């Protein structure tokens, strides 16, 4: 590539893997969202919370794809594995799965940052710090807050309704 | 009729029967609405929900009557049978009866559509599709959502109050 | 399902397959878009054209998912197969692949419509007609127009630049 | 210096060298710009593109000078070597020289960042990341895009005119 400079093949490959992780996270949130839209689940606040996250993850993937091209790397796409569940249980179950998902995305970001630092690639490191690392920390804090409130509310039916009505 | 074209006597008669069904549904919702306005029931959100449906059903009947005349059919009215109950029990009971009512209206629409298709009457089929079929599907989805939330809330008194306050 | 009415298992399954097709089409357009954003391809108008289609296909999938739930069907997601190519060649090559993709989506819509008609499911038939069938016809006409103009422009480098600058 | 803290003599000297590189880049772009303003070259879009870059590089030098003073380092200026060419050939030739220039500035930034990291100087590292590193990556991507389009357009006279008219 005419523009490629200080951009290792290792980082390029890792960025492609991170794109896959973000697209798969987006897919997972799409499924979560429409599950809460079921007539026999019917928690619109929860549906909206996850649909919004689906959009955020898709946007993250696209930001990574843009950066790949900016650096002269080449996007390679793989199959997107279907989400791990077809039915997501309670808001509590769903929020727990969401935090597990985000911690896995965060660890991937941290791993990529460590790789970038090993490869002496400050642009990559800065890119991750300004657009992904703090966003993950904030989102995980928020999910933790939600989990704590959901748990304190478990008359579980009553609690699940109130949380959706008054928090989401 | 000078204007009548491709409008079968079967469809004309069926449209008159559907008008009766819609007027009777409207009457049912009128009764539901004022029941929840009783000082010993006192659920204003529920009253409003049903009063609004009474207006929607009356409007549906009038749209059918307009179409009857547009096609050169002749409106024939029959007695409107009084609603099936004088007292409607809980919000849960009432919402269950409402969904039963709407499924019966929907089936009547589907039957009329099948008749129109058998009579090769595309105007009728289109009329039902654009003004009634999707509205029924949407309303039934909403009622199902409400039923699910009411059920999850059953401290039944507390649940009935919260649903009326926070959903309706 | 409490709300499900006149919604066959065949249609429910077919709607799930159509969701997969739309998500995969979206994925294909994502890849097409970022390919034209490569520094060694550099056709921004073409990139934007495909990115916009990626969004349209994702939106189509979500509309189908909403309808699935409205009817009381259950969303089931499968793996999303990666796009058929990693590199998309010329604008001409890409536009040809796009029209092949859209014709395949259109045929799937037509097949689902035929199924709905066989199952006497007028809501499904109307849903497809008002939100998908005409949109496909319009998009395919536009792609055909583009293909014709690209072909008339093939000094192929010059033609590809002018088309991107003056049409897209 | 009363304010100097964690600011190595090595970094101070390197920052002075980077100032020289940026001022020289600015000078190079000044020459490029006025070359395309010649009556026998006459490509106003190209002239403007380079004049704007001259201003950007001068602004970069001044930002570095400000930071030098903020940290308590002392600005030292050296002779500015004249640009490497008096006449810049085609837009293609000029854009190639511009990308060579920017890669050399980028490498200097990367070298300074590595030095800052070795000296454990996080303020320097952050300063470079937020104001220079991403700007270089973006500019180099843009130049690569331009080069690709210019090359696809080479009727070379025709191509050079069209690129200036429709891109710049
Ligand atoms: C918001 C959900 C994202 C979905 C639609 C998904 C992958 C499934 C995505 O993340 N990005 C796309 O460009 N297309 C898609 O289909
Ligand atoms: C925009 C061109 C910059 C020129 C004018 C140059 C060095 C030649 C500069 O970069 N900064 C200045 O302060 N003066 C100058 O003359």
Swiss-Prot record, chains A, B, C, D:
UniProt-listed Gene3D superfamilies: 1.20.1260.10
Tree of life domain: Eukaryota
Region (Catalytic site for iron oxidation): 52-59
One of the Pfam families matching this protein, by short name: Ferritin
Biological processes annotated in GO: intracellular iron ion homeostasis; iron ion transport
InterPro entries to which the protein is assigned, alphabetical: Ferritin, Ferritin-like, Ferritin-like_diiron, Ferritin-like_SF, Ferritin_CS, Ferritin_DPS_dom
Keyword Acetylation among UniProt keywords: yes
Subunit-structure text: Oligomer of 24 subunits. There are two types of subunits: L (light) chain and H (heavy) chain. The major chain can be light or heavy, depending on the species and tissue type. The functional molecule forms a roughly spherical shell with a diameter of 12 nm and contains a central cavity into which the insoluble mineral iron core is deposited. Interacts with NCOA4.
Alphabetical list of PANTHER family matching this protein: FERRITIN, FERRITIN LIGHT CHAIN
Role, per record: Stores iron in a soluble, non-toxic, readily available form. Important for iron homeostasis. Iron is taken up in the ferrous form and deposited as ferric hydroxides after oxidation. Also plays a role in delivery of iron to cells. Mediates iron uptake in capsule cells of the developing kidney. Delivery to lysosomes by the cargo receptor NCOA4 for autophagic degradation and release or iron.
UniProt protein name: Ferritin light chain
Origin species: Equus caballus
Lineage, top ranks: Eukaryota, Metazoa, Chordata, Craniata, Vertebrata
Gene from which the chain derives: FTL
């Amino acid at each position: 590539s005419q523009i490629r400079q200080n951009y290792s093949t290792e980082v390029e490959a890792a960025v492609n893997r991170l794109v896959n992780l973000y697209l798969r996270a987006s897919y997972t949130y799409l499924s979560l969202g429409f599950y809460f839209d079921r007539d026999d689940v019917a928690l619109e606040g929860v549906c909206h919370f996850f649909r919004e996250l689906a959009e955020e993850k898709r946007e993250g993937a696209e930001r990574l794809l843009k950066m790949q091209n900016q650096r002269g790397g080449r996007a390679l796409f793989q199959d997107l594995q279907k989400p791990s569940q077809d039915e997501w249980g309670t808001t509590l179950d769903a929020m727990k799965a969401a935090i597990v998902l985000e911690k896995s995305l965060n660890q991937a970001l941290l791993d990529l940052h460590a790789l970038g630092s090993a490869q002496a690639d400050p642009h990559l490191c800065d890119f991750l710090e300004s657009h992904f690392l703090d966003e993950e920390v904030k989102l995980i804090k928020k999910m933790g807050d939600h989990l704590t409130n959901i748990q304190r509310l478990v008359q579980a039916g009553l609690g699940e309704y109130l949380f959706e009505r008054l928090t989401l």
